[model samples]
Target: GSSGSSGDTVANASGPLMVEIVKTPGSALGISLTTTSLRNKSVITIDRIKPASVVDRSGALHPGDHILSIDGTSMEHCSLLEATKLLASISEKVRLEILPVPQSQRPLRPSSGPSSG
Candidate 1:
């Protein structure tokens, strides 16, 4: 008999978001991307967003967001070249699944200490 058979573990409290982008012919996506390490896993990250571009105008994508997939293709264990090829294959429209990074501008809370009256 099975001793310990645990079900699937729930991961990622915040699910990935699906974002769509439409580009014109001969126009670029207007967003720069790179591979980086997150939680010990390599992921594609948005490095920069060019103003006046389709991605910039949509305002759905942002820098520092990690791309999970492109055009319904998963990006897990994907290399920089593979990601670029996938992006280049798209003609006009592309759907992206991304995990957004948390904002880093929040104020820190002070540590509590024992009161000395």
Candidate 2:
């Protein structure tokens, strides 16, 4: 959720989003993420894109995310059903992100290890 802060975060939380319920097979964290929610009204989405700061971390998707036409046009709203309906219309192509990961500081990994299991 937004936590009502003037920032952005993504963990597929319980807030505004075109939620994607997944059921991964034989794996922990049983679900993988995929899109972003642009249902924050036309003005909101537009203002956000004005800065073009869409980012994804969580080792999921990196920079370079795009959002095609929304609600049959290049606009959006703060409604999940609207975005979800549009997203579901397409089968061959996908746009924006649904369950994107939050963009946090990149962690430093131990590189010189012998592949610790």
Q: Model 2: number of clashes?
A: 10
Looking at candidate 1, what is the lDDT of residue 61?
Answer: 69
lDDT of 2 at 94: 33
* TM-score attained by model 1: 0.63
Query: Candidate 1's residue-wise lDDT over 78-105, tens digit each?
Result: 8878777776676776667776446322
lDDT of 2 by residue, 19-41 (tens): 22121332222122224543643
Error of 1 at 38 (Å): 4.1
Full-model lDDT, candidate 2: 0.31
Model 2 residue runs over 4 Å out of place are 1-72, 75-78, 97-117
TM-scores for all predictions: 0.63, 0.24
Poorest stretch of ten by lDDT in candidate 2: 46-55
